[PDB]
Amino acid sequence: GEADMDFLRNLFRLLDELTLEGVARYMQSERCRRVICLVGAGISTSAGIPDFRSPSTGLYDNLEKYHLPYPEAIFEISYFKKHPEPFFALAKELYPGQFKPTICHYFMRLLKDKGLLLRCYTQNIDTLERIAGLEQEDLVEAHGTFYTSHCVSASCRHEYPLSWMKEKIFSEVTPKCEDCQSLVKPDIVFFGESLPARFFSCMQSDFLKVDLLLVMGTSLQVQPFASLISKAPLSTPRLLINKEKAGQSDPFLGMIMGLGGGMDFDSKKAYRDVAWLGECDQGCLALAELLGWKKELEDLVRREHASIDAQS
Numbered sequence: 383g384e385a386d387m388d389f390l391r392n393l394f395r396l397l398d399e400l401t402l403e404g405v406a407r408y409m410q411s412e413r414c415r416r417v418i419c420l421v422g423a424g425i426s427t428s429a430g431i432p433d434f435r436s437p438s439t440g441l442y443d444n445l446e447k448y449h450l451p452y453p454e455a456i457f458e459i460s461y462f463k464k465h466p467e468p469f470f471a472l473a474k475e476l477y478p479g480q481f482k483p484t485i486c487h488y489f490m491r492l493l494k495d496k497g498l499l500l501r502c503y504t505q506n507i508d509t510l511e512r513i514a515g516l517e518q519e520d521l522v523e524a525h526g527t528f529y530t531s532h533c534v535s536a537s538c539r540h541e542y543p544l545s546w547m548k549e550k551i552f553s554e555v556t557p558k559c560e561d562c563q564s565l566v567k568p569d570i571v572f573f574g575e576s577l578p579a580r581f582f583s584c585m586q587s588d589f590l591k592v593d594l595l596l597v598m599g600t601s602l603q604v605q606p607f608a609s610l611i612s613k614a615p616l617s618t619p620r621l622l623i624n625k626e627k628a629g630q631s632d633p634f635l636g637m638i639m640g641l642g643g644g645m646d647f648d649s650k651k652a653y654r655d656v657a658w659l660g661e662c663d664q665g666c667l668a669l670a671e672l673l674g675w676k677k678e679l680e681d682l683v684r685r686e687h688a689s690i691d692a693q694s
């Protein structure tokens with residue numbers, strides 16, 4: 383309890399039918415023991431996370447002053463080591479503290495609480511999964527996280543807490559290691575940086591025994607997820623909850639998808655994939671209701687959001 387408050391204070395085998403109802407019944411069967419969620423930006427839009435693709439907002443205004451050689455440079459490790467300022471100016475905007483987890487995030491928290499969540503693979507860097515209660519062990523953050531930070535020197539790797547980093551960034555002080563003076567950066571996985579070994583190992587193990595895949599707030603044709611979805615055993619049901627199904631646009635990926643076990647919701651061969659088109663929060667609300675978890679989710683969201691306001 384006090385630990386939860388300190389945590390927040392510092393921060394701030396098949397379906398009967400191919401329908402959401404069918405998935406809910408499957409989830410209540412004894413065969414559904416391991417669930418993997420693959421999530422993208424769509425699960426955080428209701429929290430107020432902006433569309434990072436638009437220069438519209440004042441998000442990148444502070445950056446049009448450092449003159450980056452190419453867009454990806456702000457997340458490239460060799461560039462960071464020579465010019466850390468741009469990334470830290472952007473991180474000031476991205477660090478957690480201004481947003482609360484959504485209904486969708488707390489739904490995954492329930493899966494955790496109930497012993498159903500094997501793993502949550504996320505493309506986001508808003509830290510909302512962790513704020514919602516998911517622990518490192520439950521997560522494969524494709525692009526890393528701002529929650530942990532480490533000295534960039536391979537011979538050092540000293541770790542630093544969120545409050546240590548948070549203070550520096552808001553004070554606009556470039557974080558330096560206290561042991562070796564090298565730069566310290568949040569554990570966002572930069573181009574040219576190796577990701578934790580755990581990522582590959584989870585990707586190679588988790589889909590062998592998964593009983594259900596919940597894909598939310600992301601297109602199926604996204605670099606990481608495209609491959610993971612086809613790794614699950616052939617009998618594993620897969621549910622997509624997103625506002626719209628993405629269109630084609632690219633022959634190789636498309637063909638590889640059709641030949642490798644990609645989602646099949648509508649063909650004559652469809653047998654285990656379900657698409658539920660609408661807002662992620664609405665979809666999790668719908669699913670929770672079918673499972674008899676409406677009130678529990680309700681109280682969870684209300685209570686966690688209130689703890690965040692209270693801080694303490």
Ligand SMILES: [Zn+2]
Nearest residue numbers: 533538559562
């Ligand atoms: Zn160091």
